[PDB]
Design a protein around this ligand. Structure first.
Ligand SMILES: [Zn+2]
Length: 105
């Protein structure tokens, strides 16, 4: 249980070593304006994603950061968001925990 893959197709996405405790915790539970709840895990790094559109500040869950939707680069599953435009760190990924599968490297 050391890397995270896309639950839908198996694309390699991130690693447990890359987990990032933003504000004290790598886990943040959030809702969007449609009332969907997401359990977001913050990672310093990820791969195999495809970032869509240009960054937006609207309704950002992390103060000072602008977000872009992150899809799985292989299957197009919505895996979370890439955050940028902030400070310490300038950028990071917030990935939806239950859309990943964890397993050996
Ligand atoms: Zn996928």
């Amino acid at each position: 249980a050391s890397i995270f893959r896309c639950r839908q197709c198996g694309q390699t996405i991130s690693r447990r070593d890359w987990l990032l405790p933003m504000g004290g915790d790598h886990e943040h539970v959030v809702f969007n304006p449609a009332g969907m709840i997401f359990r977001v895990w913050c990672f310093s790094l990820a791969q195999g994603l495809r970032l869509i559109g240009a960054p937006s500040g609207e309704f950002s869950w992390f103060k000072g950061y602008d977000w872009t939707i992150a899809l799985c680069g292989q299957c197009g599953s919505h895996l979370g968001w890439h955050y940028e435009g902030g400070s310490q760190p300038q950028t990071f990924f917030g990935l939806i925990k239950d859309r990943l599968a964890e397993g050996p490297a």
